[PDB]
């Protein structure tokens, strides 16, 4: 192994894979690019791979559209890349304990660098309540619409220039940890 | 250790970490930057770290969003960096004594330079009363609104140019020690 | 010790500290600056410190906001820097004799150059009566308003150019010995 040119290793969490390849978990896009380009100049292809939170989540989601298309989930969190956390829709999900254990091992196959994948049924009430709470904190009333498989919070109120930005950060916050798979959002000028 | 180029050490409180790294508690941003740049010219990376009150509080808060998302708190004070004080929402917090002791040890892990973290349940009545008192001292009446998990004091009155600045310092004062997590503020021109 | 370049020592009251450092009590800002700059050219840092009435009072007040935030006080007088006098709000203060003795020792820790700190409960009636008297001496009637924790004397009367200056000196006088912590002031044109 190594098959690593990350040094300076700041913002490069390098994890050993189960497939005998190295996965350099880069903090951001510019770091990912830096490490991939340097490894390529260095003739460390194939075995030396560079990854990040966004690409690995989308990669697993693409695999899931084919093998667990009915999986109701939120997002895979890579706060600890060696132990990814997989947020599932508590109520929309109808999988068994053992089926979820298989799902984890399948993601472990998708993530050789991961030791194990911690799949957790996240309370759909908590998802809805997180969105509810964030809006109410910003004095943003909403009308709750119902799209297939979820709800859409339509923010009421003629918002000011910066109040709109406040609502955009709220929306992004929910889309960072939960995603747009359960509560989606809209803005409409009222009152 | 050391792995220190702070000299002149004025405004650089250097504390030894539990992880065998040094944490230079700098008085301000310009000092933080000065020390980080000088340590870097000096080839004292990794083990020689430079920190401050604002970055360390935000760093712990980011960790808390993942592991104690339901933690109702105000702010972590670094008046004594070696013994950080952690203001919690007395009433909104439902944690036990031992759970709070774990929370402290978790922050001690987040702050190797800290000897211990003193977590204290701050009276939510006192928070509200601090805001109330600061406004009344400046002859600023307010309408108490209710956002999720707190209240919003909407300052009544067509304020003058400098009265507005008086209200801004009041608001900042509360946002310095309590933060915008319980009493938030607004201004509206009346009378 | 010394660790002193004050000479000419006129307007430089040099007091020995309990922390084995020297505190040059300078008469004014320009003297403070002069002594700090000269000590610095001289390589007498650390042990040779330069102080004044305004900075030392504000320094102790900042410490008090964290450890005795409920302390109702006026101002610390440095007429005799070696024995600072600490004016407290007689009625607003609810501290015991021994708690006040601790408060003094805490300020003695904040002021190594001080032998002892004389804390005195100043009659709030006298504070109010000082303000009352100063206004009445200048033929300035006022309406007594009530802000949280104090009163605001609103000066009645269309004042002339120099009468306004007379009221400003009155206000400053009260803000010199009592401060704006109990009786505050305003001006409004009437009659």
Author numbering:
A (entry chain X), B (entry chain A), C (entry chain B): 173 to 363
Question: Could you share sentences copied from the article?
Answer:
The bacterial injectisome, or type III secretion system (T3SS), is a specialized syringe-shaped protein-export system utilized by many pathogenic Gram-negative bacteria for the injection of virulence proteins (effectors) into host cells. The injectisome can be divided into three major regions: the inner- (IM) and outer-membrane (OM) spanning basal body with associated export apparatus and ATPase components, an extracellular needle, and a terminating pore inserted into the host cell membrane called the translocon. The major structural scaffold of the basal body is comprised largely of three proteins that arrange into a series of highly oligomerized, concentric rings: two intimately associated proteins localized to the IM - PrgK/EscJ/MxiJ and PrgH/EscD/MxiG, and a third protein belonging to the secretin family of OM proteins, InvG/EscC/MxiD (Salmonella enterica serovar Typhimurium SPI-1, Enteropathogenic Escherichia coli (EPEC) LEE and Shigella dysenteriae nomenclature, respectively). In summary, we report the crystal structures for the cytoplasmic and periplasmic domains of PrgH and InvG, two of the main basal body components of the prototypical Salmonella SPI-1 injectisome.
For both the cytoplasmic and periplasmic domains of PrgH, we applied a 24-mer oligomerization constraint, according to the established stoichiometry. For the periplasmic domain, we observed that in preliminary modelling runs, residues 361–369 moved during the local perturbation step, and led to a model with a diameter not supported by the EM map, and relatively poor correlation. We therefore performed the docking procedures using residues 173–361, which led to a model with excellent correlation to the EM map. The model of the IM PrgH periplasmic ring is broadly similar to previously reported models from our groups and others. Importantly, our PrgH periplasmic domain model possesses fully refined interfaces. For the periplasmic domain of PrgH, we engineered numerous interface and surface mutations. Notably, we identified a loop (residues 319–324) that mediates several side- and main-chain contacts with the adjacent subunit. Side-chain mutations within this loop (K320L, T324L) have no effect on secretion; however, mutation of the conformationally labile Gly322 to a leucine abrogates secretion (middle), suggesting that the loop main chain conformation/contacts are more critical to interface integrity. However, mutant variant G322Y in the periplasmic domain of PrgH, or Q97L in InvG, disrupts needle complex assembly. Finally, analysis of the surface electrostatics of the InvG and PrgH periplasmic ring models reveals an acidic surface present on the face of the InvG ring proximal to PrgH, and a complementary basic surface on the corresponding face of PrgH.
